Design a protein around this ligand. Structure first.
Ligand code: CLA
Ligand code: CLA
Ligand code: CLA
Ligand SMILES: CCCCCCCCCCCCCCCC(=O)O[C@H](COC(=O)CCCCCCCCCCCC)CO[C@@H]1O[C@@H](CO)[C@H](O)[C@H](O)[C@@H]1O
Ligand SMILES: CC1=C(/C=C/C(C)=C/C=C/C(C)=C/C=C/C=C(C)/C=C/C=C(C)/C=C/C2=C(C)CCCC2(C)C)C(C)(C)CCC1
Ligand SMILES: CC1=C(/C=C/C(C)=C/C=C/C(C)=C/C=C/C=C(C)/C=C/C=C(C)/C=C/C2=C(C)CCCC2(C)C)C(C)(C)CCC1
Ligand SMILES: CC1=C(/C=C/C(C)=C/C=C\C(C)=C\C=C\C=C(C)\C=C\C=C(C)\C=C\C2=C(C)CCCC2(C)C)C(C)(C)CCC1
Ligand SMILES: CCCCCCCCCCCCO[C@@H]1O[C@H](CO)[C@@H](O[C@H]2O[C@H](CO)[C@@H](O)[C@H](O)[C@H]2O)[C@H](O)[C@H]1O
Ligand SMILES: CCCCCCCS[C@@H]1O[C@H](CO)[C@@H](O)[C@H](O)[C@H]1O
Ligand SMILES: [Cl-]
Ligand SMILES: [Fe+2]
Lengths: 23, 494, 109, 63, 31, 37, 28, 36, 29, 62, 298, 50, 30, 339
């Protein structure tokens, strides 16, 4: 159906990259 | 001048050599996993998973591989018994060599961290001493543990990217590795529900990620910093040994009682399935379901599978064991070949008799044969006792319905005595007492050995926790040096 | 203002004190030594710790040892750890308020 | 310092607890007569778990 | 009847005790 | 460069050797009957 | 106080239970 | 919905929090009275 | 059998005579 | 004091060695979370024991 | 002449091992009982204990291990007869009747009595009190009661305790079957003595190592102690030794009086109600378990 | 002390935290803003797999 | 093979009795 | 303010020390002892075991017990609010809920008592060796009263808080488990008997080799925490036992570490044995003696003598000790001696 998992992972990586750049 | 029981304490004030020692431990545990997988693949019989599965062969490490989805080997057999499959690289041999080469790589980096011990990162620039930031280390490590917990639960156990886990029916007949979906609601807190495992690892991974980001943010308060003694490395060892014996008591409990993560196709049936007679009830229900459809006793008793009848035998529950009775269970009574049938005992007046089964507490049991209501009608006496009921005074015969012997009556009282002695154990099975040189003395399951080992280990880690809490809190009296005393104090005199 | 082992009594044997302040100017220790005090010439009452009574307050030390030679007690060694400059100023104030009355020299090393 | 407010009223209350027979009704102990019923020799053991609060009083109407 | 039960006995003796004797002569060189 | 000042030597006197040999030997004497079976 | 709670926890049920046990001697 | 067992668990946890709150309230009150 | 009897008799009476003359006499020196 | 590349990367994480928050900090938040964890472990332990039997939760092998 | 060098070698308090006058009896009797124990444990023929021919093999070479091996007691055909080798006809008849048991227990009890005499003699010549001898007299009375007083009271040396690991458990099981030793109070004082002696050993050894900081010798006994205890005469060692001692004396004279069939006042509440119905107690479960071993022993 | 050796940990000097400098204020703001969008992605992954 | 194993473990304890009684360590003198 | 005024009130000087751990210890120890006294006085065992076990029935001190719950209860916690008691106090007494009341309070009171030893050693400033020595009765209590019935079918197979019930527990373990043949048990017997021997020898030789015997004995200053361990000469007692026994202690510290270490290691080893027997991993049978006894019937040792006595214990105590199983054993299947 709706691919929320193919957009939540896209927003995860982006958010996870900002966590390591503020470490 | 260190004693033998203090020789590791040279790694307390040296973090890089501590990384080396932990890396050498992690190398030894990974090398054990590869070596026990190879030793288990050396001696294992995949030909008959009905009457000789992996919990009967003493396989300890094989069910933990098959639980997460490793089925099938490079030789060309499966665990479920297909004997032709393309399992990929990730067979039993593939994960065995993966842990072997992992063990070698962690040994090499243990040697690097042992010889390049003096890095600047373990030092502070102001003081000369080596120091570590343990509340931020816990935040990085909790963020990692939550990230890999969420990854395991959302990607492995769902089958979105991976196999699922082992799921079976309630009675252990049909079991495989399937993708299971997470169970939100109160049915996720059922231990025998495999969706609560997935909903757990999603939810506890999210909670661990939030808490790890919290500790990277927030410094500890002053009161519980000098109360719980952060700055000591031994408070972390103390609290870790606490959580570790908590977790070991939990895995011994869910191994002994059963859950969805310790199923009976992989680990064998529990003792409580014999205590409540969980398989005799399903066997009687299946027979009465076939008998009320208008079938014979042979047609109803022949419809029962051999595996369901194998679960109803006292040589498969783990509370019939010995501590020094080593080996697999096939050393215990032999390798099971066929279900002999279902013994129905007759009283020479056409009356059905019932053998009182043996409970798991007894090392030996008397053979007593009673009625539907419960009056003792026959028994095999002790040795030379005044037989009143006996076996030939009442004329006990044994007929067999279903199984190998099907429709064979035995009117010869020594064979009736031997069949009744085997019928106190539950269902009667034919064994291979050769090919392993087995005796008749019962062994215990992998379920029993896992529960024994980690109950003993959790009890010893209780003492280890007390000793390290008493070393962390009482440090100024165990040394003579106050922890908040700087180690160079110029004298004044008086 | 004076030292006492059993609350109510006033140890009339002066100690040799040895101070050891941290070159960091914060943590400190004061190794006392009482050579044959009154609390070791028999008294029966149980020592509960070494107390320093004064007019600002009272300080306590639970590190109190007793030296025994051939069964007989001969000496007492109590070591008090400062670990705060806010406590170090208190102990140096107690030390001259005690040394003014019993007499002691402060041979700065 | 002198402490004699109520000593023997407690001893008389403890005597009257088991003298009148209240403790058999509170703690559920049977009387020497009320061990077995008038016809059975079987022991009223507690069988299956969650019916147990019924099961004991299933025996306690047999008297 | 165990054949390697004899082996598990000897490794019960020869593995710790040697570790004591090696630890003994290592501190007879220190002194 | 510097040869790791965190290394202290390990001591085992003759008496701790005797107590350890006594412990390992009577543990083997207790447990050999169970290892043999 | 400091002495009242040891009396109300220990000496009251000991005197009550000694009344119970001393009246048990004349049952049956 | 709420079973007999869930109502019994809520009653037990409520009574245990009443006991655990009441002992710390009484000990806090006796400590704030005796301030020597 | 007779020779073991007189051997044990001789050795037992020798050891108790040693014990008795070590207690009765030989008290100084 | 070797100055490696990865030691330069991971340097700000091992930088606050004894940093402390003043006084009591977030100890009441920790205490209500420890209490919620205790209530949760009681809920688990009584579900597995069938001391709290819930609607639609059958604690057996089915 | 030279008899003085031997007399002062025996009386010497500067030897490595003290060889007293009681050691002059103690060394050959304990060596004879030691060498016969090591021989009869390894290699010994099976011993019949009953009058029937069902002999109990207790040696190591006849298929036993450390746990099940024992020196079997002498037979019922001996009883309270003194049985040396020269009373028997053959040596094989001496081993079949169980003569090694009588040999080992007689030389062992002589040598253990002389070991008590050696402790008394060294305390006398060092000019000391006899508190080590009196504390040794509780295992000595407990080894007299088990090996000598109980086979004399039961009328035969077969009733004594066998010298082996599983044989002691067989002795204890048969004693619980015949005598109900667990409900007799002289045995419960021994359990209180042994349990409290273990308790006082752990509490005393923890509390001294907690507050003993350093000690030295001349090469004067200097000792620094971390004193000052908790808040609101010193013969703690007399209580520490005398608690376990009189505890073991009570059970030693307890089974010495159980030897002569003087069973202590049994606390058996045989509660019966008025219908002829039996209400069981917990002493009835123990009495059923004792009846299950008395019938098993025949 | 009997004639042996021991080892105990060397604790760093405890100092109370100062209020944040803006180099750390931006770092902490980027930390919370990374974490909340991370756990917003994880609930969508959880909603997709369920 | 088991009997000489039990006798060997017993004889090692009997030899350790001799080596601990007579070859005991001298005290550390200062 | 909030926390400190409580903290120095608790750690104040008093009759008893009531620390922060006194809040755990005194309700839990008080309700464990109160549950055992109100169970031995009034509460019966008629519906769980079929026994009369109170002072109300006529039992003496050696015969009362607070009995284990029935086997059908399982490992239920038996809370008074409950799914089984449902608020009712009388049924909670009749189902055996007082056993779980005393056992859970024994667990949390032993936790609180070992915490109080840490609290008393922390303010005095000594090393907490007494709290480490108390970890052996905590290990014995958890391995016997908690780990053993949780490995079994229910709480029914557990010691039942009475003198004769504990004697039933000992005879049960001889019959059904062969517990005296377990090597962990043999280490436990060795630890307890050697600890009793250690304290008997040590008290006998402190009071013998004293510094001031009886003549010039001016009583020096006694310190309560010294335990009078400074009134004897280690030289004289070492010179005695080097001549009598050959081996001797040369330390006043290693002696008391050995005195701590011997019975605590004994109790920890027997705890490991009962944790193994929780899942019936018992050292019951040597396999070689089993085959050597099944080979020829003239092979009798004391071991094969003991296995028959265990069979007698099992088949003669089992219809009355376990009444829920409904064992009907006729007279001809009971193991007799002349059979
Ligand atoms: C919807 C969200 C969700 C769901 C469905 C689950 C589902 C589950 N969780 Mg998870 N959990 C979650 C969110 C969730 N969780 C979150 C957000 C956290 C916080 C990070 C956790 C933290 C957590 C823990 C800490 C545990 C679970 C456990 C479980 C399981 C309970 C069933 C069981 O077998 O317990 C069996 C376990 C118990 C009943 C707990 C026993 C508690 C003991 C008795 C405490 C005392 C122990 C102490 C050492 C003394 C023992 C003495 C003894 C020797 C006699 C099940 C898979 C349990 C588990 O892992 O089971 C395998 C478990 O222990 N969860
Ligand atoms: C993560 C778990 C863990 C870790 C990392 C440590 C680490 C440490 N311990 Mg602790 N401890 C633990 C758990 C742990 N312990 C447990 C469970 C207990 C109770 C058993 C203890 C009881 C304990 C005591 C009583 C002492 C320590 C001490 C020490 C320190 C020196 C250790 C040493 O040099 O031994 C050297 C050990 C040897 C040379 C040989 C030991 C051989 C053993 C007994 C048998 C063989 C074990 C086998 C190889 C391992 C398989 C393990 C697996 C089955 C668990 C070190 C900091 C010592 C101390 O504090 O120093 C100041 C100390 O006195 N520990
Ligand atoms: C005999 C038991 C015992 C003892 C004496 C200790 C002693 C110690 N603990 Mg450990 N601990 C224990 C068991 C014990 N612990 C258990 C079972 C756990 C859970 C795994 C822990 C987890 C733990 C951690 C994580 C830490 C300690 C630490 C400490 C040290 C400081 C004191 C403290 O924090 O107490 C803790 C308090 C208690 C054990 C009392 C608990 C009382 C509970 C809350 C009562 C609950 C009642 C319950 C709800 C009733 C329902 C029952 C249910 C079955 C129906 C000290 C060495 C700290 C330390 O090492 O600092 C250096 C530390 O960080 N403990
Ligand atoms: C380098 C240092 C070595 C030191 C070792 C010292 C000896 C210590 C171990 C003693 C083992 C005796 C058995 C030897 C016979 C044998 O081999 O048992 C084996 C099992 O062992 C094993 O599985 C070892 C793993 C044991 C795990 C079980 C849980 C233990 C928890 C311990 C808690 C600790 C307090 C396998 O059994 C054998 O192999 C079977 C076929 O695979 C056959 O049945 C054989 O007849 C035979 O039984
Ligand atoms: C270098 C390298 C390599 C190699 C590697 C390897 C070779 C590995 C192996 C590893 C291994 C091979 C390991 C092993 C391990 C094992 C272990 C670690 C074991 C242990 C054991 C134990 C610990 C035991 C214990 C015990 C006992 C004693 C008996 C009884 C039981 C118990 C448990 C108690 C390669 C080329 C690949 C590549 C990379 C590099
Ligand atoms: C259960 C419970 C509870 C509790 C209660 C309690 C807590 C009670 C208490 C109780 C008590 C607390 C009791 C007591 C009792 C006591 C007694 C009963 C005593 C007796 C004594 C005697 C009898 C003595 C004797 C003697 C001796 C010892 C010797 C000498 C002589 C004489 C005689 C003196 C409650 C309700 C809360 C809740 C619910 C549950
Ligand atoms: C110091 C001293 C001395 C001495 C030394 C000695 C003299 C030692 C000895 C040693 C000895 C002199 C020992 C003995 C022994 C004997 C015996 C031990 C007997 C017998 C045996 C037997 C009779 C055996 C038998 C048998 C059996 C059991 C079975 C098999 C066969 C046979 C026949 C082998 C002198 C004089 C110089 C001086 C004084 C003091
Ligand atoms: C004071 C000290 C006195 C100590 C005296 C004894 C010390 C030395 C004891 C050595 C005894 C050796 O014991 C020897 O063992 C082997 C097996 O191990 C036995 O042999 C036994 O098993 C073998 C198989 O192994 C069979 O073939 C044989 O039929 C059987 O009797 C021998 O019968 C015995 O001769
Ligand atoms: C349980 C421990 C909770 C401590 S909480 C702490 O306590 C202080 C009073 O001591 C308060 O002033 C402070 O605001 C509060 O957060
Ligand atoms: Cl017998
Ligand atoms: Fe002492």
């Amino acid at each position: 159906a709706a691919a929320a998992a193919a957009a939540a992972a896209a927003a995860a990586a982006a958010a996870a990259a900002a966590a390591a750049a503020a470490a | 001048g260190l004693p033998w029981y203090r020789v590791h304490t040279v790694l307390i004030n040296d973090p890089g050599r501590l990384i080396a020692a932990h890396l050498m431990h992690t190398a030894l545990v990974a090398g054990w996993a590869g070596s026990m997988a190879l030793y288990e693949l050396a001696t294992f019989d995949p030909s008959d998973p009905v009457l000789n599965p992996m919990w009967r062969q003493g396989m300890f490490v094989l069910p933990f591989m098959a639980r997460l989805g490793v089925t099938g080997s490079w030789s060309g057999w499966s665990i479920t018994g297909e004997t032709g499959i393309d399992p990929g690289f990730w067979s039993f041999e593939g994960v065995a060599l993966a842990h072997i080469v992992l063990s070698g790589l962690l040994f090499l980096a243990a040697c690097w961290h042992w010889v390049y011990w003096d890095l600047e990162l373990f030092r502070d620039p102001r003081t000369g001493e080596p120091a570590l930031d343990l509340p931020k280390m816990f935040g990085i490590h909790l963020f990692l543990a939550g990230l890999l917990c969420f990854g395991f639960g959302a990607f492995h156990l769902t089958g979105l990217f991976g196999p699922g886990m082992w799921v079976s029916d309630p009675y252990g007949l049909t079991g495989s590795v399937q993708p299971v979906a997470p169970e939100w609601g109160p049915d996720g807190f059922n231990p025998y529900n495999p969706g609560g495992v997935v909903a757990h690892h999603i939810a506890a991974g999210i909670v661990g990620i939030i808490a790890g980001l919290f500790h990277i943010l927030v410094r500890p308060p002053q009161r519980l910093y000098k109360a719980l003694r952060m700055g000591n490395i031994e408070t972390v060892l103390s609290s870790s040994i606490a959580a570790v014996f908590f977790a070991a008591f939990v895995v011994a409990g869910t191994m002994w009682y059963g859950s969805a993560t310790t199923p009976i196709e992989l680990f064998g049936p529990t003792r409580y399935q014999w205590d409540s007679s969980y398989f005799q009830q399903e066997i009687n229900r299946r027979v009465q379901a076939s008998l009320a459809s208008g079938a014979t006793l042979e047609e109803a008793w022949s419809a029962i599978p051999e595996k369901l009848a194998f679960y109803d035998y006292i040589g498969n529950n783990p509370a019939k064991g010995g501590l020094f009775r080593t080996g697999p269970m096939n050393k215990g009574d032999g390798i099971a070949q066929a279900w002999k049938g279902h013994a129905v005992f007759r009283n020479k007046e056409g009356e059905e008799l019932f053998v009182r089964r043996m409970p798991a507490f007894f090392e030996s049991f008397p053979v007593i044969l009673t009625d539907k209501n419960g009056v003792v009608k026959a028994d095999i006496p002790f040795r030379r006792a005044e037989s009143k009921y006996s076996f030939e005074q009442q004329g006990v015969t044994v007929s067999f319905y279903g199984g190998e012997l099907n429709g064979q009556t035995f009117t010869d009282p020594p064979t009736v005595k031997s069949y009744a002695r085997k019928a106190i154990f539950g269902e009667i099975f034919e064994f291979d007492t050769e090919t392993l040189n087995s005796d008749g003395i019962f062994r215990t399951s992998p379920r029993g050995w896992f529960t024994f080992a980690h109950a003993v280990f959790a009890l010893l880690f209780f003492f280890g926790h007390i000793w390290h809490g008493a070393r962390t809190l009482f440090r100024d009296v165990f040394s003579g040096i106050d922890p908040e005393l700087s180690p160079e104090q110029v004298e004044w005199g008086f | 203002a004076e030292i006492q082992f059993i609350r109510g009594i006033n140890e009339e044997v002066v100690p040799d004190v040895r101070l050891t302040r941290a070159r960091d100017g914060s943590s400190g220790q004061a190794m006392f030594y009482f050579d044959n005090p009154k609390i070791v010439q028999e008294g029966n009452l149980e020592v509960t710790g070494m107390y320093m009574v004064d007019e600002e307050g009272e300080i306590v030390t639970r590190d109190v040892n007793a030296k025994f030679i051939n069964g007989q007690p001969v000496a007492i060694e109590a070591t008090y750890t400062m670990r705060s400059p806010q406590e170090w100023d208190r102990f140096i104030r107690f030390m001259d308020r005690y040394a003014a009355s019993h007499g002691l020299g402060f041979q700065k090393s | 310092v002198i402490h004699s407010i109520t000593i023997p009223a407690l001893f008389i209350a403890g005597w009257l607890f088991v003298s009148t027979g209240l403790a058999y009704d509170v703690f559920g102990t049977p009387r020497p007569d009320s061990y077995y019923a008038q016809e059975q020799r079987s022991i009223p053991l507690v069988t299956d778990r969650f019916e147990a609060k019924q099961q004991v009083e299933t025996f306690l109407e047999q008297l | 009847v165990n054949q390697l039960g004899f082996i598990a006995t000897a490794l019960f003796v020869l593995v710790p005790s040697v570790f004591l004797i090696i630890l003994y002569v290592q501190t007879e060189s220190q002194q | 460069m510097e040869p790791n000042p965190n290394r202290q030597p390990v001591e085992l006197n003759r008496t701790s050797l005797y107590l350890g040999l006594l412990l390992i030997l009577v543990l083997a004497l207790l447990f050999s009957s169970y290892f043999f079976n | 106080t400091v002495r009242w709670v040891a009396v109300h926890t220990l000496a009251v049920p000991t005197i009550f239970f000694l009344g119970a046990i001393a009246a048990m001697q004349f049952i049956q | 919905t709420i079973t007999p067992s869930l109502k019994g668990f809520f009653i037990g946890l409520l009574s245990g929090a009443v006991v655990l709150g009441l002992t710390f309230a009484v000990l806090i009150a006796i400590s704030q009275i005796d301030k020597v | 059998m007779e020779t073991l009897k007189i051997t044990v008799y001789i050795v037992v009476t020798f050891f108790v005579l040693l014990f008795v003359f070590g207690f009765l006499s030989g008290d100084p020196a | 004091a070797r100055r490696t590349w990865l030691g330069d990367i991971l340097r700000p994480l091992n930088s606050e060695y004894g940093k402390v928050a003043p006084g009591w900090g977030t100890t009441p938040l920790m205490a209500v979370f420890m209490g919620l964890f205790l209530v949760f472990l009681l809920i688990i332990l009584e579900i597995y024991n069938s001391t709290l039997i819930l609607d639609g939760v059958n604690v057996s092998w089915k | 002449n030279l008899w003085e060098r031997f007399c002062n070698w025996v009386t010497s308090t500067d030897n490595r091992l003290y060889v007293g006058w009681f050691g002059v009896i103690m060394i050959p009797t304990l060596l004879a009982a030691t060498i016969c124990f090591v021989i009869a444990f390894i290699a010994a023929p099976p011993v019949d204990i009953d009058g029937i021919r069902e002999p109990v093999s207790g040696s190591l070479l006849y298929g036993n291990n450390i746990i099940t091996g024992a020196v079997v007691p002498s037979s019922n055909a001996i009883g309270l007869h003194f049985y040396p080798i020269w009373e028997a006809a053959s040596l094989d008849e001496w081993l079949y009747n169980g003569g090694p048991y009588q040999l080992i227990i007689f030389h062992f009890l002589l040598g253990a009595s002389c070991y008590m005499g050696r402790q008394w003699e060294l305390s006398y010549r060092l000019g000391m009190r006899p508190w080590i001898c009196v504390a040794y007299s509780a295992p000595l009375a407990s080894a007299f009661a088990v090996f000598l007083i109980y086979p004399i009271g039961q009328g035969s040396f077969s009733d004594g305790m066998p010298l082996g690991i599983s044989g002691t458990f067989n002795f204890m099981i048969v004693f619980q079957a015949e005598h109900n030793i667990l409900m007799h109070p002289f045995h419960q004082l021994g359990v209180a003595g042994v349990f409290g002696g273990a308790l006082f050993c752990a509490m005393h050894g923890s509390l001294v190592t907690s507050s003993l900081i350093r000690e030295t010798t001349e090469t004067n006994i200097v000792a620094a102690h971390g004193y000052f205890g908790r808040l609101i005469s010193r013969s703690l060692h007399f209580f520490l030794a005398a608690w376990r001692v009189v505890g073991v004396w009570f059970a030693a004279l307890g089974i010495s009086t159980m030897a002569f069939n003087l069973n202590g006042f049994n606390f058996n509440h045989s509660v019966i109600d008025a219908k002829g119905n039996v209400i069981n107690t917990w002493a009835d479960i123990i009495n059923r378990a004792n009846l299950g071993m008395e019938v098993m022993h025949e | 002390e009997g004639g042996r050796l021991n080892n105990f940990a060397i604790e760093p000097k405890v100092y109370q935290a100062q209020p944040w400098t803006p180099q750390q204020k931006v770092r902490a703001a980027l930390l919370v803003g990374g974490g909340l969008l991370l756990v917003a992605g994880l609930v969508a992954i959880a909603v997709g797999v369920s | 093979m088991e009997t000489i194993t039990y006798v060997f473990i017993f004889a090692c304890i009997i030899a350790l009795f001799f080596f601990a009684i007579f070859f005991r360590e001298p005290p550390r003198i200062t | 303010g909030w926390f400190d005024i409580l903290d120095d009130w608790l750690k104040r000087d008093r009759f008893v020390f009531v620390g922060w751990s006194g809040i755990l210890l005194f309700p839990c120890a008080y309700l464990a002892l109160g549950g055992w006294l109100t169970g031995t006085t009034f509460v019966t065992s008629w519906y769980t075991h079929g026994l009369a076990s109170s002072y109300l029935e006529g039992c003496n001190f050696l015969t009362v017990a607070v009995s284990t719950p029935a086997n059908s209860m399982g490992h239920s916690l038996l809370l008074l609010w409950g799914p089984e008691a449902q608020g009712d106090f009388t049924r909670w007494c009749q189902l055996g809920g007082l056993w779980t009341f005393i056992a859970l309070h024994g667990a949390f009171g032993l936790i609180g008592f070992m915490l109080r030893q840490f609290e008393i050693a922390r303010l005095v400033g000594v090393r907490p060796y007494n709290a480490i020595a108390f970890s052996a009765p905590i290990a014995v209590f958890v391995s016997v009263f908690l780990i053993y019935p949780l490995g079994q079918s229910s709480w029914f197979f557990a010691p039942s808080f009475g003198v004769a019930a504990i004697f039933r527990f000992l005879l049960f373990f001889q019959g059904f488990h062969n517990w005296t043949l377990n090597p962990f048990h043999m280490m436990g017997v060795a630890g307890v008997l050697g600890g009793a021997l250690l304290c008997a020898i040590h008290g006998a030789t402190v009071e013998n080799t004293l510094f001031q015997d009886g003549e010039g004995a001016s009583t020096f200053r006694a310190f309560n925490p010294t335990q009078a361990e400074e009134t004897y000469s280690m030289v004289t007692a070492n010179r005695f036992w080097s001549q009598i026994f050959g081996i001797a202690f040369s330390n006043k510290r290693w002696l008391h570490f050995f005195m701590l270490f011997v019975p605590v290691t004994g109790l920890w080893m027997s705890a490991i044995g009962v944790v193994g027997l929780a899942l019936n991993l018992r050292s019951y049978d040597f396999i070689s003696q089993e085959i050597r006894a099944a080979e020829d019937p003239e092979f009798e040792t004391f071991y094969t003598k003991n296995l028959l006595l265990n069979e007698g214990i099992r088949a003669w105590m089992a219809p009355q000790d376990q009444p829920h199983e409904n064992f009907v054993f006729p007279e001809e299947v009971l193991p007799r001696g002349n059979a």
